[PDB]
């Protein structure tokens, strides 16, 4: 009874103390994790920004390949519409060279 | 007299013949010349034609210069305005990697 | 004596289960927060990788961008010796005008 | 008698100056008739000169023109290289967005 007695009370110490312990590594493993998801949540606000900014990205390349496409259309037919106005002078030209093989049909019967 | 009368007439008749044959290479020249003129109004004709087409050949060069500016102006044109937008990505892209290397800081911490 | 064993053993029970569960505690939030760290570790290689693609694969647009410049300064070059060649079809062409000019007057005074 | 005598002389005379005349006549019609003839030749000869360099001239146009071409190729070229590397970034980059999603996914759940 006695002799259980000092060994409840044994006991009774140990435990405080250990409980004691534990509640300071807990402590210490909290302020980590604090730290630790304080990150994570700047690192998800700073992931979503920088996958926005990707979307972007991939609208403006889209864009981009718009304005090469007009481009590559407005040059093709800017020169065209030209290439039909220099026809029309070489064919003037193959005329103007006709009327010259006449007239120099014309010339050489002369005595 | 008469020593002088079939002398002269022997000379009149010589005469006859020169002045007939003169008339003869008068007319092979007053035939020829009336051809070399009608040629000559032809050749008139012809040159005023030829110089109308050659006035109409300088007004389609002159047309087709002005038409070669413009292709020059709307290729310069579009391609510039592709260049603008191919420059906004790329600024769009330089961002980015700035945006990473910011998270790269936040996370060389974690341990 | 009785009851104040009985107190202590209660006592030294709920202090036994106190210890369970603080170290069950200390446990689960360590496997927690090394879970975190593995991920935010994971995510510094990734951002990592990202922002080196990026670099590459930009440098791949401004290189072709390169090649475009070239092909269209060389248009330009080619359409400005064009616009040259015009001016000059001009320029010979009016000397040719003046020219039939001059074999007109010359028609008009043998005529 | 001695009247025809006289009467000889008269047409003597009379053909001597038609001779003159018709000589006269003969020499104003080769002058006028070399004349027409020289400016004939002249522009047969001027006509062959001007078809041969309105012929060389609309050559070197065409020429230009080819060159034109050439360079406008090498452009269109260019750009649908370029128009092959934005739909290559496009996609490239769409992937790079797939994974900043994939990564926003897993910072949540390790919360
Ligand atoms: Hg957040
Ligand atoms: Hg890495």
Same mark, same amino acid.
């Given at each position: 009874?006695?002799?259980?007695?000092?060994?409840?009370?044994?006991?009774?110490?140990?435990?405080?103390?250990?409980?004691?312990? %534990?509640?300071?590594? %807990?402590?210490?493993?909290?302020?980590?994790?604090?730290?630790?998801?304080?990150?994570?949540?700047?690192? %998800?606000?700073?992931?979503?920004?920088?996958?926005?900014? +990707?979307?972007?990205?991939?609208?403006?390349?889209?864009?981009?390949?718009?304005? %090469?496409?007009?481009?590559?259309?407005?040059?093709?037919?800017?020169?065209?519409? $030209?290439?039909?106005?220099?026809?029309?002078?070489?064919?003037?030209?193959? $005329?103007?060279?006709?009327?010259?093989?006449?007239?120099?049909?014309? +010339?050489?019967?002369?005595?």
């Amino acid at each position: 009874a006695e002799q259980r007695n000092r060994d409840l009370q044994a006991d009774n110490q140990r435990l405080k103390y250990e409980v004691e312990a %534990l509640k300071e590594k %807990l402590e210490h493993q909290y302020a980590q994790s604090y730290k630790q998801v304080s990150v994570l949540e700047d690192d %998800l606000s700073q992931t979503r920004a920088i996958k926005e900014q +990707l979307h972007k990205y991939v609208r403006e390349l889209e864009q981009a390949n718009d304005d %090469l496409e007009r481009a590559k259309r407005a040059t093709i037919v800017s020169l065209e519409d $030209f290439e039909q106005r220099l026809n029309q002078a070489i064919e003037r030209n193959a $005329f103007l060279e006709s009327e010259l093989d006449e007239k120099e049909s014309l +010339l050489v019967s002369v005595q």
